[model samples]
Target: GTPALDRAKLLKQYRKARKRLFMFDYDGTLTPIVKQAAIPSDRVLRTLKTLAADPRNAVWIISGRDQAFLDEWMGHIPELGLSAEHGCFIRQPRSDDWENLAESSDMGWQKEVMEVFQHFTERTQGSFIERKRVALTWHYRRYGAFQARECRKMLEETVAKRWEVEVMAGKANLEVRPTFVNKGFIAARLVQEYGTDPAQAPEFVLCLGDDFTDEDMFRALKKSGLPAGHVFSVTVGASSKQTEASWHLLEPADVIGTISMLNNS
Candidate 1:
């Protein structure tokens, strides 16, 4: 029979288990979704600090957010590792270095994409385009569903004709990728690096998030042979519409409860 274990036991067993990985999606998981400002929660710093303080866990934040932005928002988090740009960028807080899986602005593709967004923002009423270091995100969070869909379709058709770029749809928004970016690609790299054979790596992999971009990470975990039972998805509103993940964490308080349970059990 499968036996239930306590926190200490779980840690011991996990330490004994090979190749364990814990990856988190930033926006909704670490920080509550705020309409006013796109930022992580203040407690996120503390929560991450606690997770990283524990030696047994390989903690990584695999976020759609960019590295420089993460550095600005979550940079102060001590000892935490990050896979930013939906995995296109990586950084280890313990070390001051950051790795970019995508090319810098020098890539001519970005210039054309940026120009397209510039045109989009100018052409589309009540729509705005956000420029990131590695990816370009078009947010229609302010508009109605119809407008959002239209904007997404516009980007989609535009991207279909363009080479070296792809448009991915998400909640209230859409994204343009330059041939190299996604959640799964980055998470796989992060986990493999952390879950090397020498140490009893974590056999479990958890990915908690609430967004369409997050699906990419889910797909990535599956491809890595990480069981579907391991990755976790979390959502805030009904509109987010996450169709994957094995477990569900309801409400804000549940986060604290789950953390307490994971830490104390």
Candidate 2:
């Protein structure tokens, strides 16, 4: 019944020597994050479980959501490795424990970050800050985007450089994180883990991302020490060509079409 015993048992089960790595991005890369409270639908979840069932595959969901969110939605699938809060936390495959990598990365700088949020909120009639363990999400009430813009500018020019943290502002919400933690480092870290063993070296690696946030990961995978034959960096839901990826798939629907059929071979 102990957590450590469960994890130890999970480890002792077997090393299947997986060769193919499927690194996925959530929120529109796999399936659009819609419906307010809605998470991944049945079809997407089913596709993930089936592909991960293969002995040759190593599946991972590398996403920026907080702990509780990923645990609630993707936690049950034991086959998938869940990287939550970017690289700040990790839940290894078949493991019940969630590791907190960000505990050493202090939340001190967020003091000024809180000021940045309130400074802008003071200017507008509407805004609120939802605090989490590692980051803050600022929601600007309707018609308050202009104030949000000034907030974004202040964080970048003032707080970001000194703290070595960065702000991400978009239609959804504004977020902040230190630059050292990123999808690129997470991808490279996992790759080098396997690269340590010659037998476990990658023959197939797939990274699918939809938004500009993924471009950094795409760029890092380029130097993943994998040759062209070993890696596929794909940008989905667009041919508009803003990606660092070499290939592009035109629609989100194609992810299902692409994954559903491609896993067999």
lDDT of 2: 0.74
lDDT (10s digit) by residue, model 2, range 1-265: 0011122221222232247788898877887657535478888888898888886778899888887888988898888899987778799988999998768776788899998888776766667888987777788745566677778888878788778677877684788876646787778777887856556687777788877778888888888767565677777755556667867766567777677765544
- By summed lDDT, the worst window of 10 consecutive residues in model 1 runs over 1-10
- Model 1 Cα shift for residue 75 (angstroms): 2.1
- lDDT (Cα, 0-100) at 117 in candidate 2: 85
- After superposing candidate 1 on the true structure, give the runs of residues whose Cα lies further than 4 Å from its correct spot: 1-19, 36-42, 66-69, 85-88, 104-165, 169-176, 194-201, 227-242
* lDDT score, candidate 2, position 254: 72
- Model 2: lDDT of residue 37: 59
lDDT of 1: 0.61
Instruction: Find the 10 residues in a row with the least total lDDT in model 2.
Output: 1-10
**lDDT for each residue of candidate 1 in 1-265, tens digit (9 for 90 to 100):** 1111133444454544444456777676666666627665555566667766666566777776757887887667656787776567777757678876655534555666666667656756677878776677777666445654665576567654665666776777777776456665566666666454533434666566666666666666666655444434443334334444434554444454455455553
Q: Model 2 residue 98 lDDT?
A: 95
For residue 64, model 2's alpha carbon misses the true position, in angstroms, by 2.5
